[PDB]
Amino acid sequence: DIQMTQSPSSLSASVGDRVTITCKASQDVNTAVAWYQQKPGKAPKLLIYWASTRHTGVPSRFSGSGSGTDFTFTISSLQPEDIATYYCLQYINYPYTFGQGTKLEIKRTVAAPSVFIFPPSDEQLKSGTASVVCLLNNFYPREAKVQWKVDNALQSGNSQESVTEQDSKDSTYSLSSTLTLSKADYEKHKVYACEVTHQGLSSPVTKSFNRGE
Amino acid sequence: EVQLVESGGGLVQPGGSLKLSCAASGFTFSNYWMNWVRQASGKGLEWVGEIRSKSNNYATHYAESVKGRFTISRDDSKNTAYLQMNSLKTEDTAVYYCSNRYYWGQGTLVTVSSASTKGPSVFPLAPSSGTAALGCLVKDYFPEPVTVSWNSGALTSGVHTFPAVLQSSGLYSLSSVVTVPSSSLGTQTYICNVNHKPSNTKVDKKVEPKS
């Protein structure tokens, strides 16, 4: 079975940079190689086949080259919308084999998150559970610390976070943190706070509400 | 103009069976070799198999992980390709894509689990008292996926729909948020349209400031 090993597994580059990804076949595969782009949430799209032929309507800034065992995928000028995982595929023999993919990220200037806190709805409190949500909107880079406090007590092990992929225009991330408490625990405390630490903030930002109010 | 529409994906018992369909238009179907590829959540593309044209005696080739369990077939008169899946394992859990080698379909999720279908609750993330954030919490569902739109798809700018999180309960939760002008909060209606097709659950939730 023909191994396709891609390099590198992940890449960070600036907008306008020439980007290069290589794929090494474990045998001669002639020019029987395709490159696929998979953007966040979407099906993979064919960019290059026969190692170097561009599929119809694909932008000229995408190119492939190589023969036998060594293959190159090039973006001449990386654009914001090029956020994706790129895959090579071998197709001379069954079984066809994919590379493990190269996740392409964009470096840009620091952007501080906008922070929002959301109390649990009255509708949810009827169910015996309370979800408190902290939103960090449109920040770069990805590294961000969210701390939950309930009446000054740091909360640990009772929250989960989710982060979007890099936005296809502004190259920012967004992050939601959900603190899950019992209705009884929620009703027993007053002050609910999320504290956000980020390179873009001169010092940590806290958003809070008082349950009663 | 070229379309591949996958259907037949859903929740199935381990040891169970399922047939996927791929409805093709915009190309001379009978001349193309149809492929299935699958992707487990947060993982790479894995080739499933290929069926060649009538000229090639409808010859079929399979990945080793599926051979003996999965059958690819085609009906050229219907412009349709099929993936029959028998003796399903938890490891078969993935989004399944159909291709004519040049174009791929949207793909369809197969979940192999003994876990029960559960429909979500939808709760407001109400805006505070000039940019405002608001949203919908889609809580406690299985299996994936849910879809969220805002005002039936008329509101797309400033929308972030987060990846679903698997909770300790073994149920999913997902938040969708939008940032809007704070001046618009009094006047403009904001509705998140939630659909969990596996549980036949469709909700429209109006989100507004708490009084």
Residue numbers in the entry:
A (entry chain A): 1 to 213
B (entry chain B): 1 to 129, 135 to 216
What do the study's own words say?
Covalent attachment of methoxy poly(ethylene) glycol (mPEG) to therapeutic molecules is widely employed to improve their systemic circulation time and therapeutic efficacy. mPEG, however, can induce anti-PEG antibodies that negatively impact drug therapeutic effects. Antibodies that bind to the repeating ethylene oxide repeats of PEG are termed “backbone-specific”, whereas antibodies that require the terminal methoxy group for binding are termed “methoxy-specific”. Here, we determined the first co-crystal structure of the humanized 15-2b anti-mPEG antibody in complex with mPEG, which possesses a deep pocket in the antigen-binding site to accommodate the mPEG polymer. Structural and mutational analyses revealed that mPEG binds to h15-2b via Van der Waals and hydrogen bond interactions, whereas the methoxy group of mPEG is stabilized in a hydrophobic environment between the VH:VL interface.
The final model of h15-2bmPEG was refined to a resolution of 2.08 Å with an R factor of 21.1% and an Rfree of 24.5%. The structure of h15-2bmPEG contains four copies of h15-2b Fab in an asymmetric unit, which all share nearly identical structures with small root-mean-square deviations (rmsds) of 0.161–0.417 Å for Cα atom superposition. Each of h15-2b Fabs shows that a hook-shaped mPEG fragment corresponding to 7 ethylene oxide subunits (about 300 Da) was bound into the pocket formed by the VH and VL domains of h15-2b Fab. It forms a van der Waals network with aromatic side chains in Y32H, W33H, and Y102H from the heavy chain, and Y36L, W50L, and Y91L from the light chain. In addition, the PEG backbone wraps around R101H. The terminal methoxy group of the mPEG fragment is buried in the VH:VL interface pocket, where V37H, W104H, L89L, and F98L create a hydrophobic environment to accommodate the methoxy group. It should be noted that the co-crystal structure of h15-2b Fab and mPEG was crystallized by using a 6:1 molar ratio of OH-PEG6K (15 mmol L−1) and mPEG2K (2.5 mmol L−1) as a cryoprotectant and an antigen, respectively. Taken together, h15-2b is more likely to form a complex with mPEG2K instead of OH-PEG6K. By contrast, the mPEG chain is clamped by aromatic amino acids in the paratope surface area of h15-2b to form the first CR-like structure and then bent into the VH:VL interface to form a second CR-like structure. Structural comparison of the anti-PEG and anti-mPEG Fabs reveals that the h15-2b HCDR3 loop coupled with these conserved residues assist to form a tunnel-like structure for capturing the mPEG deep in the VH:VL interface.
